[PDB]
Amino acid sequence: LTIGVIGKSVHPYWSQVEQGVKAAGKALGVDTKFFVPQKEDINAQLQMLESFIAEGVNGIAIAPSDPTAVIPTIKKALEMGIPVVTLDTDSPDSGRYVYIGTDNYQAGYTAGLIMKELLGGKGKVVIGTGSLTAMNSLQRIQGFKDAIKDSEIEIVDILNDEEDGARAVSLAEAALNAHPDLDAFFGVYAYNGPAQALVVKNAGKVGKVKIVCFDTTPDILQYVKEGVIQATMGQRPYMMGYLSVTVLYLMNKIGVQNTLMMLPKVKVDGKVDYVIDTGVDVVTPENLDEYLKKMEELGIPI
């Protein structure tokens, strides 16, 4: 059997997902194809998707940079008898059987409450994300807004870098100059937190300008350690990759229905959906050490 997985960018975050993909494949005796474009690239994801289908893979897990754009192709994959699940970010109307990843809206809400606390309920915030089409970005941002709604905290900007590191840095660097009265940064994607951290450090504003972001890749954790980042919403990319392969494997061996019978279910608009929530680890400078301990203890060290 062969299973194909499609990510959204070349960030180390997707490396963790790939490791999960390969480990699951090795444990189950399955071949895995992994693809991630350099930066956000909807057309490349579509072509790779078209390609995996033509190759006749037995399963596809995809993290859509655009949930609507992939619907027709995902429908074809399903017509061709190839199971499809989403991971990292969802496309609920595509026909994908299961979404596997973080509860994005809530992850953002939590980050919003943390921010609300750090700023004492007031101040100006600039948001940095790598997409304005991916549903996971929109949900994290939406949840952030909903969490600070009952305060005087105002978001003065939402900057999209298309999942490009240099671009994320220069956009945050300019936003800092356009807003010398900025109180905080909110990084929605893995590139954003450490980009805003470099900006703030470069301007000598560590502590002055708060940073609440996502993920726990090396560069981020190092800034959390230096105290530049007060809090980051850590995900479980590895698990997302490992369970995606597993779920698709089962759907081939035991069938789509039997596989769904054993997964967590939720209700959307009075209808049943399937969601495996991989959880978030709220990491701050105070609990960093426990985090490095907890991770290695769970089997995914450093």
Ligand X SMILES: OC[C@H]1O[C@@H](O)[C@H](O)[C@@H](O)[C@@H]1O
Q: Which residues bind a copy of itself (CB under 8 A)?
A: 24, 27-28, 239, 242-243, 246-247, 250, 253-255, 257-258, 261-265, 276, 278, 298-299
Query: Stretches 169-177, 189-197, 273-281, 286-294: which one binds ligand X (CB under 6 A)?
Result: 189-197
Q: How many residues bind to ligand X according to rule CB under 6 A?
A: 15
* Binder among 88, 162, 164, 183 for ligand X (CB under 6 A): 88
| Partner from ligand X, a copy of itself, none binding residue 191, C-beta < 5-8 Å depending on class | ligand X
| Partner from a copy of itself, ligand X, none binding residue 130, C-beta < 5-8 Å depending on class | ligand X
Residues 109 to 148 in contact with ligand X, rule: CB under 6 A? 130, 134, 136
Dihedrals φ, ψ of 157, to 5°? -170, 150
Helix axes 237-253, 12-28, angle to 10 degrees: 30
Residue 117: CB minimum distance to a copy of itself, A: 24
- Determine the distance from the C-alpha atom of residue 290 to the mean position of all C-alpha atoms in its chain, rounded to a whole number: 23
Here the tokens at position 255 are: 């069938």
CA distances in angstroms from 272 to 60, 98, 121, 264, 269, listed in the order given? 21, 11, 38, 10, 9
Residue 96: CB minimum distance to a copy of itself, A: 16
| Partner from ligand X, a copy of itself, none binding residue 278, C-beta < 5-8 Å depending on class | a copy of itself
Query: Stretches 78-86, 187-195, 201-209, 219-227: which one binds ligand X (CB under 6 A)?
Result: 187-195
- C-alpha angle 145-151-156 in degrees, rounded to nearest 5: 55
With beta carbons less than 8 A apart as the criterion, state whether 107 and 140 touch: yes
Residue 38: CB minimum distance to a copy of itself, A: 30
* Binder among 8, 96, 210, 236 for ligand X (CB under 6 A): 8
With beta carbons less than 8 A apart as the criterion, state whether 143 and 113 touch: no
Contacting residues for 43 by C-beta, under 8 A, at least 6 apart? none
Q: Is residue 5 classed exposed, middle or buried when 0-12, 13-18 and 19+ CB atoms within 10 A define those classes?
A: buried
Q: What does the binding site for ligand X look like in residue numbers (CB under 6 A)?
A: 8-9, 11, 13, 88-89, 130, 134, 136, 163, 189-191, 214-215
